[PDB]
Amino acid sequence: LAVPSWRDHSVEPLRDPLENLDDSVFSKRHAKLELDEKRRKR
Amino acid sequence: YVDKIHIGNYEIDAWYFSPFPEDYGKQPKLWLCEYCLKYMKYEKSYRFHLGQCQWRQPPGKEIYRKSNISVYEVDGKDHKIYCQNLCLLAKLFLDHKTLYFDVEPFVFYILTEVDRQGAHIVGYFSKEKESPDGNNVACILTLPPYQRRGYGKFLIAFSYELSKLESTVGSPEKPLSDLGKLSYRSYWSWVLLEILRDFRGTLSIKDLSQMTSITQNDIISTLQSLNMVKYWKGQHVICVTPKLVEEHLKSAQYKKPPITVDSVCLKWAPPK
Ligand SMILES: [Zn+2]
């Protein structure tokens, strides 16, 4: 809306089950944007 | 455009665009782990993560604990991914926020509500370790479902408690969210009125600056908005009267923050 809000949602853990949540993944994905940011500041 | 996130026990509507990288920025919903703040585009990823992740608090150091609130100090160089994820989270609710990946130059102070399940993020501020203008806050945020409870003013008070231990003055770095703008005005006014009430206004601007770590400019600005300062033709002089101070501390407009920082509960010193 014009007035963003929130609500209570519960989700249950999934015990015996597409995205890799390894730190490795995030550092790779973020590497370039860091450099981009450093440069723009420079 | 990310329209909403699920984080902990809330689905929260996003207020603003945030540059979640690659395809993540295109999702209408993202799921964030409430403890390590990693984002995910698929609900199942989130649900699996729930039972795998062993974090029940921010990384870094718990430097404040009073009743059910704790503050954790997180150095952007020690926990870069967490901090990048924090900034992306923040940007969803912060209009004017501009870096989110170059986190090494920042320390982050994460405000948490603590229960038996863990320490739950409710807000934060970032602080540039080496500010050339001595800014003691870069960005500050209370997450929407926790707003209106005094957490913003707590974090602001907290930033000055850090500056006090550093024995320096400090000021937030422009720009601040409009909500931040009002919290500062309210916090500064209260703090100064508390002192001018108890010292019968017999101190200089410099004195006030030393007692609070609020810069002289910000003290002057606040006193102007309170109509309690005048430019004697060379310098700014405090002009306070019992009537002014009493009828200000009365108008509910100026109220003590509901949550204040207890110095004895802060275990911290600046680096060295
Ligand atoms: Zn996690």
Curated annotation (Swiss-Prot), chain A:
Sumoylated with SUMO1. A motif (Bipartite nuclear localization signal) lies at residues 28-42. It is found in: Nucleus; Nucleus, Nucleoplasm; Nucleus speckle. Induction: Up-regulated by gamma-irradiation. It comes from the Eukaryota. Residues 19-37 are annotated as: Interaction with KAT8 HAT domain. Component of a multisubunit histone acetyltransferase complex (MSL) at least composed of the KAT8/MOF/MYST1, MSL1/hampin, MSL2 and MSL3. Forms a MSL heterotetrameric core with MSL2. Interacts (via PEHE domain) with KAT8 (via HAT domain) and MSL3 (via MRG domain); both interactions are direct. Directly interacts with NUPR1. Interacts with TP53BP1; this interaction may be required for MSL1 DNA repair activity, but not for histone acetyltransferase activity. Interacts with TTC4, ECM2 and PIHD1. The coiled coil is formed by helices from two subunits in the MSL1 homodimer. Belongs to the msl-1 family. Non-catalytic component of the MSL histone acetyltransferase complex, a multiprotein complex that mediates the majority of histone H4 acetylation at 'Lys-16' (H4K16ac), an epigenetic mark that prevents chromatin compaction. The MSL complex is required for chromosome stability and genome integrity by maintaining homeostatic levels of H4K16ac. The MSL complex is also involved in gene dosage by promoting up-regulation of genes expressed by the X chromosome. X up-regulation is required to compensate for autosomal biallelic expression. This is Male-specific lethal 1 homolog.
UniProtKB/Swiss-Prot annotation, chain B:
One of its GO terms (biological process) is negative regulation of epithelial to mesenchymal transition. Zn(2+) binds at residues 33, 36, 49, 53. This is Histone acetyltransferase KAT8. Component of a multisubunit histone acetyltransferase complex (MSL) at least composed of the MOF/KAT8, MSL1/hampin, MSL2L1 and MSL3L1. Component of the NSL complex at least composed of MOF/KAT8, KANSL1, KANSL2, KANSL3, MCRS1, PHF20, OGT1/OGT, WDR5 and HCFC1. Component of some MLL1/MLL complex, at least composed of the core components KMT2A/MLL1, ASH2L, HCFC1, WDR5 and RBBP5, as well as the facultative components BACC1, CHD8, E2F6, HSP70, INO80C, KANSL1, LAS1L, MAX, MCRS1, MGA, MOF/KAT8, PELP1, PHF20, PRP31, RING2, RUVB1/TIP49A, RUVB2/TIP49B, SENP3, TAF1, TAF4, TAF6, TAF7, TAF9 and TEX10. The lineage of its organism: Eukaryota, Metazoa, Chordata, Craniata, Vertebrata. Belongs to the MYST (SAS/MOZ) family. It is found in: Nucleus; Chromosome; Mitochondrion. GO terms for molecular function: enzyme binding; histone H4 acetyltransferase activity; histone H4K16 acetyltransferase activity; histone H4K5 acetyltransferase activity; histone H4K8 acetyltransferase activity; promoter-specific chromatin binding; protein propionyltransferase activity; protein-lysine-acetyltransferase activity. The active site is at 173 (proton donor/acceptor). Residues 1-272 are annotated as: Sufficient for interaction with KANSL1. Histone acetyltransferase that catalyzes histone H4 acetylation at 'Lys-5'- and 'Lys-8' (H4K5ac and H4K8ac) or 'Lys-16' (H4K16ac), depending on the context. Catalytic component of the MSL histone acetyltransferase complex, a multiprotein complex that mediates the majority of histone H4 acetylation at 'Lys-16' (H4K16ac), an epigenetic mark that prevents chromatin compaction. H4K16ac constitutes the only acetylation mark intergenerationally transmitted and regulates key biological processes, such as oogenesis, embryonic stem cell pluripotency, hematopoiesis or glucose metabolism. It comes from the Eukaryota. Changing residue 173 to Q: Abolishes histone acetyltransferase activity without abolishing non-enzymatic 'autoacetylation'. Abolished ability to regulate mitochondrial gene expression. It is an enzyme of class 2 (transferase). It is linked to Li-Ghorbani-Weisz-Hubshman syndrome: An autosomal dominant disorder characterized by global developmental delay, mild to moderate intellectual disability, speech and language impairment, and variable facial dysmorphism. Some patients have seizures and autistic features. Brain imaging abnormalities are observed in some patients and include decreased white matter volume, enlarged ventricles, thin corpus callosum, and gray matter nodular heterotopia. The modification N6-acetyllysine is found at residue 97. Propanoyl-CoA binds at residues 140, 142, 148, 152-153, 177, 186. Acetyl-CoA binds at residues 140, 142, 148-150, 152-153, 177, 186, 231, 255. The modification Phosphoserine is found at residue 171.
